[PDB]
Structure formats: structure tokens, C-alpha cells
Amino acid sequence: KTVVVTTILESPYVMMKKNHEMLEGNERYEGYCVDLAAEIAKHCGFKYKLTIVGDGKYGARDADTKIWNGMVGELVYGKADIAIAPLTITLVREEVIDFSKPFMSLGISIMIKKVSPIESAEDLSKQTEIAYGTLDSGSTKEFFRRSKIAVFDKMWTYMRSAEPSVFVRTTAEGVARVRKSKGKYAYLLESTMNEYIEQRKPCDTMKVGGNLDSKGYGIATPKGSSLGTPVNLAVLKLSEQGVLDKLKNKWWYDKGECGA
Amino acid sequence: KTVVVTTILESPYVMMKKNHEMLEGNERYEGYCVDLAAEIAKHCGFKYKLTIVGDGKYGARDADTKIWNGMVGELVYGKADIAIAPLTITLVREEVIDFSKPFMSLGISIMIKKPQKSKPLTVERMVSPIESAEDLSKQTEIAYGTLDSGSTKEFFRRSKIAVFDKMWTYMRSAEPSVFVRTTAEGVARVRKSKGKYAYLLESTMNEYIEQRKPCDTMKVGGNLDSKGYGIATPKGSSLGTPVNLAVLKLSEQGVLDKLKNKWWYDKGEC
Amino acid sequence: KTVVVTTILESPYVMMKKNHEMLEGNERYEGYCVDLAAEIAKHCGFKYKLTIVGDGKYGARDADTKIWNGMVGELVYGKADIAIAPLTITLVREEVIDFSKPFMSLGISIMIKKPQKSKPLTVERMVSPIESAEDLSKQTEIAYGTLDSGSTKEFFRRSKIAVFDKMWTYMRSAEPSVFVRTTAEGVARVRKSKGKYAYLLESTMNEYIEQRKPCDTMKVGGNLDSKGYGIATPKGSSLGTPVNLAVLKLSEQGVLDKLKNKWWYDKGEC
Amino acid sequence: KTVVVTTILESPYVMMKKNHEMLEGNERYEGYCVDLAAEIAKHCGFKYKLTIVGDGKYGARDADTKIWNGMVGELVYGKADIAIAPLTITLVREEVIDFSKPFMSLGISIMIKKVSPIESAEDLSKQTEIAYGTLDSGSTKEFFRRSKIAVFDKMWTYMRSAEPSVFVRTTAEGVARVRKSKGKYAYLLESTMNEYIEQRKPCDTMKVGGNLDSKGYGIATPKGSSLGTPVNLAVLKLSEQGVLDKLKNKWWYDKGECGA
Ligand SMILES: NS(=O)(=O)c1cc2c(cc1Cl)N[C@H]([C@H]1C[C@H]3C=C[C@@H]1C3)NS2(=O)=O
Ligand SMILES: NS(=O)(=O)c1cc2c(cc1Cl)N[C@H]([C@H]1C[C@H]3C=C[C@@H]1C3)NS2(=O)=O
Ligand SMILES: NS(=O)(=O)c1cc2c(cc1Cl)N[C@H]([C@H]1C[C@H]3C=C[C@@H]1C3)NS2(=O)=O
Ligand SMILES: NS(=O)(=O)c1cc2c(cc1Cl)N[C@H]([C@H]1C[C@H]3C=C[C@@H]1C3)NS2(=O)=O
Ligand SMILES: N[C@@H](CCC(=O)O)C(=O)O
């Protein structure tokens, strides 16, 4: 039996091949998550079919609908059997899907186009001169929405009452918006994507401050699926062998198309 | 029903109070781990009595007996219900106990005695003989060893990377013994080994020791790997999922970050 | 019985909220005095309806008429029960109303338009034409005035100190009138007089305006005197002692200074 | 009828002149408080006799006996009719005595030996190398005792568990102790006394940091006394006339026996 795999087009996690028009099958996709899925299949001993979500979203609860979108929806409603992607582990997700051990650490980061008067997010909240936004249907807006810290509460109140809309459809669109804003806009994304962007050419963006929280990406499985334990063991074993570190170095720092 | 919480006397996780002679019960201890246990008990209602492992060992397999010893061992045999302590999540441990999501990240680091200033117009620069694990393996004048019955020793034993393989080869056949019985033992060996000994230990304890007086030691190089501390639980226990959700919730509120800052950076000096 | 609280539309004490067009009740306002009144009502339980003075005046006794106008007047004549507002404690007001212990210190200061930095090896030095009150009275090119029907004007009118007597003599007989009807109007006059008008106002308001955008005004010299803001209460009322105890408790608990810091220094644009 | 006035021997509030053995009556005392009492008597129109409290105590509640000692006890128990002294206005005091308007502002300050390593209260509390103490039976210890702020709670816990006794009977003895500690002792006292000490020879002590809070000195009268309103009006009139400022300048900076 073939296990269907859902994943999002995220760099450097899943990329579209430069010759993907003439390429078919699992060889048409490449990236960190493609390699992760290949090793997971090899360790578990199953055949997998790579698929891309119809909606370019990670997953969130809708407004008064109780409906999951993105990969979480593809997993809960029986449309998929596993999800290998940068899916942040969150309480509102673990209650509906099975999360494996984190295969990559990360945090909330601030990315700003090139004295550094922004520094930490505290001064970012204290000053309203520059507008900042996040990604819709992810884990950053969800983190800001249910935060009990007063400072994060003020940031979220600014986020919701933003004119015009500050949330961006895709992280690439957010990168383009901050690039073309001439330093008037800031983007709140995760540490891994922030590093991958600020380190790739043309290196016109940068990461300021630190990490507002500590999170991780996990392999997601349907609630009650028998594949959760094998993929958890596979992730643990790959961590012991340090293959995750080698994949991170290959897809992040091996090329290094910048002067650093 | 009261559930016994196995733990280990490790700073700043679990430390005895200054007035611990007159005190009794759960008030005998302080640090990160006792606050973590209090938060876990607040999340899901249970009665817990703090206990310390008799042998003071984190957990590993014995020699030719296939017997689990230490925290993991006494969790498997039923002597404890939950292990709220800096237990490292590993492959072998997960096969016999249930781990939760990591509540704190860590890596394997190198601790050496802090050298003196260069003092050569008038600038004092710090020169260290060891800057990474590779040159530590290449060199021979400085000895290095890990803590026995711990995750670092088991990681070096099964490592297939060439640098780590040769490191483990040296450590296995090192005369005299380079392994230590406790973290404080290795720290003392580093402190009064005249810079001839290096300690391979977790990053968090390394920063804790480096941040406190007399602070005559420093951490060299980056982290050898990336692991985390998880709350342990026997297979099939009803506590697993509630504790996992409690750890997730505490991570979401930033309680873990606040506890780490309060017990690591706030009380720092030098 | 619901008591009526009288305030004044003064920043950052009582400020109109952005979404105040669709808001009814005590949620229309924000600032320092609103939460001060909230804490007062939490200490001594009562229901309060925040009201704004009709004429927007702090309080003064009109000569040859013997009628108090403004917040003090409407507190005296029975149409008010408590005045939680930046009302300055004075000798004349105390004889007619009950004041509590001061909840925030203050002093009379001078506000001038911030001058341009001096070009001359490459240091930008800041030169101001007025540095105290003695030279402000000695000079004549820069006019100065106070707020009408305020504490500062009454202080200058009855002042027997030579410099203050000269200042009051100049202000009383001056064409055009140097007195202002509102603090914001005086600040606008200072900003649009091209440095030819100095405003005599309280130190708290002056510092708040200096700390906020566009940051084109500066405070010169020290405070001319030392006074305080007190919660007003009609003479022979039952709310005086509980309000005084509440003010003392808030001062000792750190509510007052935390509120002042979070409404003055936290939102510092410049 | 002669109004009995109680006061404490505090500088520059009350002094025993320089040849008080040859002087009798109110002519043998000098200071800020003596002048203040003189103006109070002039405004109210009464004859007063200056007396020094037998116990050098500002006033506090004893060990589970509910007894006031010092000037507050001298007023509550009918021993005196008024107290002109640096009596800090405190919430617990106001419940038993009538306080006038504050005639002198102040705050809690830190006085150390002559970039300080402690400066702020946070660093001083964190650093346990140097012991810090307050005045026994005053108001600083009372303020620290009932502080619910975490930092001040930690400082108070350090205060109570101090070996040997860090509290000092008299502020002059505290000054002597810090002068005889080689910078190993810090004294927590009021801003006015700290400034007066640091602005007098030989000027080996300095004030560091800001003020922990804002207090004031009041003129205390027995509960339900007819003198409270006249002395309150006198204080207001003196403040409006600027006499209090001139007295502070006379007794704090006019002499200026320091190099600065
Ligand atoms: N350096 S990294 O971000 O690519 C990275 C991050 C992590 C890795 C492995 C790597 Cl290579 N493994 C850990 C896992 C291993 C075991 C201990 C913690 C989890 C379970 N999670 S992690 O701390 O999120
Ligand atoms: N900054 S830290 O080391 O105290 C720290 C480290 C970590 C935290 C939370 C904190 Cl505060 N939570 C994460 C967990 C939360 C969810 C996402 C990854 C795991 C599941 N693990 S972690 O990456 O090991
Ligand atoms: N720092 S401040 O201006 O916000 C400020 C100023 C003052 C405060 C409290 C604060 Cl937070 N309390 C005092 C009062 C408290 C008790 C002691 C003096 C009076 C009665 N008045 S004050 O000296 O006018
Ligand atoms: N500059 S000072 O410390 O000598 C000083 C301090 C103060 C003075 C007067 C002087 Cl001179 N008067 C005020 C009083 C006057 C009226 C307003 C507040 C009280 C009632 N209290 S105060 O703000 O504590
Ligand atoms: N990987 C994140 C993306 C959200 C973000 O871009 O912040 C998630 O699954 O929610």
C-alpha cells in the first residue's frame, strides 16, 4: 500500500525542481523535507507518494467553523496518512493530530531590511512608527492570539487592529513586501526561514533581536494512526546518527550564496 | 493517590535549601525542576512527593546483564510514576519509557579551565588550547571524559562519526579513568586539574557553572549535537498525555522561559 | 448610591479614546486619573460615573464676586462628590474643600520652544536664551504667561518674592494677553511663536509634552516651587478619610509610581 | 497653656546648639525643625516648649503587644500635643495619628563608600557580597516589611535573616558603621539625610542610584486634636510663601562644608 504524504512548498524544505516539467514521481521534488521523507520511508520500510496541499497553508481553526485547513485538515479528515513539513508543534494541534519529536528547533524572529533602532520585540511594541506583520493560518498569529504576557497582548492588539491588512498570504510574499517597503515594514517569521532568507542572495534583509519563544517542527500523523511510533523512532534515530544536522547543513549552509 | 516523582540532585535543577535541616517534605528542595513539578501538578491534579534516586544515576544499561539502572531503570520497574528531571531524550530510552515534548533544549559541550590573559599595545586577549571537538581528539596533552551512566557516554559509544569514534576510542582505553561519577566531580576535576582535563557535559549545566563564582571555567566551541530534556513516564501510563499537554501549555505561556531566566541568568555573577 | 467623579480632559491624565464615538459610560476615557479612580473605587467600594467639568477650568475664586468656578467650584456647590484629577493643593482651596495626601509631586516649570543645535571641533551644542526665572523676568524679548484660572496664576498673583512679583507685574499688564485657556493651547502658542513665548506650567505636563512627538519643546531650569496633586472632596464629607487611606495605600503599594512610569516613560517617542 | 512639642535629635532638623549647657528653654535648640516649630507657633499663636523624646524612636508597633514607641507613642498616649520632626507619613501611622500636609519631600536612597557596582536596587539586591541595613524602628524597615513587590520582598528576606544584626539603633551609628566598613556596608536611609550627610565634611560617603519610592515628612497630632487644622493651614501657608524652601536651603546648602 502507498502512503500519501502532504507537504507545503517551503524553502529550503520542499522546492520545485528546475527541470520539474520533464520530471515525474518523487524525483520531481527536492529539499530538506523530501530527503526527510525518503529517510523516513527507508527506515520504516514503506512506499510513499509526495503530494502538495491544495491550499498553501499549514493549518488553523477557522472563525466559528471548527474546520481545519492546510496539512492539519488533510491529516484530520483522512485525506492524508502523514505530513513531513515545517509544521510547528502547538497545543491546539497535538489535541487533534499526533506529533513526533521535534526534528528542528526554531523560534519567533523579526526580519528587517537593511544603528539598529529596533532591537528586541519590546522596543518594537513600544514604537509604532514601523508596521509589522505575520503569516495567515500558521503558528505565529496563533501564538500571538492566545498569549497571556501583557507585552505580547499589546502586540496582538496592534496586529488585529491594523489598517490595511498586514497578514500576508505566503512567506515569500512577506519577504517581497519587506524588500520593497524600504525598511518601513517588518515581518515576523520563524528562525529557520529567517536565516535561510537573510543568508541567501541578495542578502538585503537581516534578523534583529533574538527568539521570542522556543518551538520545533514535528512529523504529524493522524490521531490514532499506527505510523506515529515508527516515525517518532525514525526521527530519534536520525537525530542520534546526526543525519538531521547534515541535512540542515546541506540545505542551509553548504551553498552559502553570500559573503559571510 | 500520591505519585512518587523520581528526580536527581543537580543544580540549578534540584538543590537543597539553605535551611533544609529543619525543613521537611517538598520544601526541602529548590530550583528549576521543583517549580516544573509544581506547574505539572497544578495543570493536572495529583499529589506528588519529591524523591531522589538512591544510586544518583541518570540511566543506562549494565554490563552483560541487560538491566536498566538509575532513573530510567527505577521508572521501568515501577518504583516511580513520573520523572520530572533533566532526563535526556534518546533512542534507547524511548523504546522502554515514554518521553514528553522537550521542555528545554541542550547540546553536548566542552568545559575547560579558563586560561589566563595573554598580556603581551595594552590589550588582554583570551587564548585557549582547545577550540573544537576535532582538535581535542587530535591533541593528546589534554585529557577529556564524560559522565558515566549518562546520555553523553551512550552517545559517544554508538557514534559513527570519525571524530566522535576516535574520541570514544581514546576515552574507553584511557588510563587513569576519565569518566566521573557526578557532574560536580567532573567540574572539580576541571577546576583543579591545572587545565589538563576537559569535561564533556550538557550545555545548560556548563553555562550555569560558567555564570557563577568563582567562574574559573569556560565553554569552548559550539554544541556537539542537539538534544532536549523530556519528562519520562512508563509505557502505557495514564500520565503520559496529560503531562505532554502540560509541557506544551507551559511552553506556550513562556513559564519555561521565565523559569530558565530566573534560575540561570538572574542569579548570575562575574 | 452612585457618586459622580469630576475630571479634566488633560493628557496623560484623562484622554479621549480613539473609539469613543460609539462608547457609552466610563470606557470613553483613558490615561492616569481614570485608573487612579478605578483603584480608589476598588479600595472603597462605590459606583462612579466619570464627568468632565463644564467650563474646563481647574478652579479659582472670582474677585468682587466670591464665587468659585471650575472643578473646585462645582465641588463646593454640591454638584460633585469627588474630584479625582490633577488638582493642585493650595492654601485657598483647602479652606473650602478637603484635600488628600498628594499622589504625585509637581513643580512650576518653564516651557520654551526647543532651539536649533549650534554648528561649532564638530560638536553640536544646545544654547537656550532662558535658563531660569530671574533672567526670564529680567529679559523682555520673550513673552511668558500661565494658564487662566489655574494654580500657577494664583501662585504668581499672591507671590511676595521679588522675581515672582516682577513676573506677575509683567503678566498682569501685557498686550496682547499672555494667559491661556488650556494647556494644549499654550503649548501650541509656544510651538508657533518661533521661540518668542515661554509657557509657565506644571513639571509633569511639561515633561510629558517634551517626551512625546514632535519633540519640539524643551524645559529650561528647575521647578519654581514644590507642590502636589490631591484628590479633592467637599468640606465635611464622609469620603475624605477613606480616600486618604486609599491614596496612602496606593502610594505604599507602588501603584502610583508604576502608573506614572507606564503613562509617562513607557511611551517615549523621542 | 503650654503646648508640649516632641522631637528627635536629628541633623539638620534638631541640634543641641554648641554650648547648650549654658542655655535653657527653647534657646538651647537649633535646626530646621526648631525654626519650623517657631513659625508654627507664630502662625497659630500658642506658647510651646521643645522636648526631646526619651527614646530615640520614630515610631513602630512592638512584638505582638500593640504598643507605640517614641514620638508616635508620645502622641497617642497623651504625652505630647504635637510632634515637629522628620516623621515619615505612613499608612499605618495615619490610622492612629493625624498627619498634616508634607512639608518636605523625600524617598528611600542608598548611601555607600566613595561607576558604582550596585547603583540600582535590583543589582544591590542581587549582589550579596555587600551587606545592607536600615534604621531600627523607623519607616524604611516598615516599608520593606509590607512590600508585596518581588524584588523588595527578596531584599526584606535578606534583611530579616542577617547575621549579625544589620539594623542600627541610630542613623548616626549607621553612618559610623558605613564609615568603618571599607565599603563592605550599605545604608538604606532617606534622601534628605543622605544628601545632608554627603554634603558635609569629610565627604567620604556618597549616594548612589535613584529613589525607591516617594514619601514625605508630616507634622503629627493626636487623633481628634483641635490643632491639626491650624498646623495644616500653617504648613500650606509656609509652603506657598516659600519659607520651607528657604529653610531647607539654609540648613542643607547655605553652609556647605564639603568640596563640591
Ligand atoms: N540543529 S537542528 O535545528 O537541525 C536540530 C534540532 C533538534 C534535533 C536535531 C537537529 Cl539536527 N533533535 C531533537 C530531538 C531529539 C531528541 C531530543 C529532542 C528531540 C528528541 N529536537 S531538536 O532540539 O529540535
Ligand atoms: N529557551 S529554553 O531552552 O528554556 C526552551 C526550549 C524548548 C521549549 C521551551 C523553552 Cl523555554 N519548548 C519546545 C517544545 C514545544 C513545542 C515545540 C517543540 C517542543 C514541543 N522544546 S524546546 O525547543 O527544547
Ligand atoms: N514619583 S511620584 O511623583 O509619581 C509620587 C509622589 C508622591 C507620592 C507617590 C508618588 Cl509615586 N506619595 C506622597 C504621599 C504619600 C505619603 C507620604 C507623602 C505623601 C503621604 N506624596 S508625593 O511625594 O507627591
Ligand atoms: N523642596 S522641599 O523638599 O523643602 C518641599 C517639599 C514640599 C513642599 C514644600 C517644600 Cl519647600 N510643600 C508640599 C505641600 C504643599 C501643598 C502641596 C503639597 C503639600 C500641600 N509638600 S512637599 O511637595 O513634600
Ligand atoms: N511552520 C509554521 C509556519 C507559520 C509561520 O510562518 O509563522 C506552521 O506550521 O505554523
Ligand SMILES: N[C@@H](CCC(=O)O)C(=O)O
Ligand atoms: N542529562 C544527561 C546526563 C548528563 C550527561 O550524560 O552528561 C541524561 O539525562 O542522561
Ligand SMILES: N[C@@H](CCC(=O)O)C(=O)O
Ligand atoms: N494643575 C493646576 C492647573 C494648571 C496650571 O495652573 O498650570 C491646578 O490644579 O490648579
Ligand SMILES: N[C@@H](CCC(=O)O)C(=O)O
Ligand atoms: N524618619 C523615618 C525613619 C528614618 C528611616 O526610616 O530611615 C520615620 O519617621 O519613621
